[PDB]
Amino acid sequence: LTSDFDNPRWIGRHKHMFNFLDVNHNGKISLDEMVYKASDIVINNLGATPEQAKRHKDAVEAFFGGAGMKYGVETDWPAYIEGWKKLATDELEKYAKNEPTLIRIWGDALFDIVDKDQNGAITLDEWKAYTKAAGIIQSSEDCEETFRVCDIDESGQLDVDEMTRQHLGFWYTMDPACEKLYGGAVP
Ligand SMILES: O=C1N2C=C(c3ccc(O)cc3)N=C(Cc3ccccc3)C2=N[C@@]1(Cc1ccc(O)cc1)OO
């Protein structure tokens, strides 16, 4: 429901992600890298069309732009987490006005690519395909946890509306009910 920026676990969740994103361990990451990673995944691993990839890129671009990242600029850890506070509150503000959040826009873009039927719902195998391609999750075990937490069994599908809700609490408010959204892959 609300921000929780001084919760060491909120900082830890994003510190983990920051380190996951800083593959070359430069201690900084740029928007160029983020958008490269986003498009490399959908085009080279998930077979998205140029149009789909484009929509997905614009979404990823806005997402990390909301955290203050920019092209031709390297964001270090301190700026990153500070910038994340702003992203989180802006997202919360959009939420309040029933305005599409940046994370919502991303999900829609991504699910249209990952969902074979292009309906906004993906299977456990599709979730695994995406998560393991991006690297955010490494084991099938942690991917199942996602469904266990979203309340969808191995045969049902994860819907974007439901996942969005999960992300609001996982990434923005530290909602206790969203713990283990990514199994043990993300603190
Ligand atoms: O949510 C997601 N992510 C959050 C962060 C992330 C990054 C930094 C942070 O501080 C916090 C979170 N990083 C990645 C992985 C990624 C990063 C950059 C480019 C491509 C992919 C990621 N993939 C998503 C995509 C997604 C979006 C909406 C949905 O409904 C379903 C799936 O799946 O859960």
Domain locations in the chain? Answer: 1-187
Choose which CATH entry (1.10.238.10, 3.10.450.50, 1.10.10.10, 3.20.20.70) describes domain 1-187. 1.10.238.10
In the numeric block, which tokens belong to residue 73? 């600029």
d(CA 111, CA 144): 18
Q: Which DSSP helix (H) or strand (E) runs through 159? A: strand 158-159
Q: Which atom of ligand 1 is nearest to the CA of 103?
A: 28
Closest Cα to residue 20, out of 67, 58, 77, 66?
77
Active site residue 80: no
Closest Cα to residue 155, out of 124, 127, 121?
124
Closest Cα to residue 187, out of 175, 170, 165?
170
In terms of Cβ atoms closer than 10 Å to its own Cβ (0-12, 13-18, 19+), residue 163 is buried
Question: Judging by DSSP bridges, how do beta strands 121-122 and 28-29 pair with one another?
Answer: unpaired
In the numeric block, which tokens belong to residue 149? 């937490």
Annotated binding site for Ca(2+): 22, 24, 26, 28, 33, 115, 117, 119, 126, 151, 153, 155, 157, 162
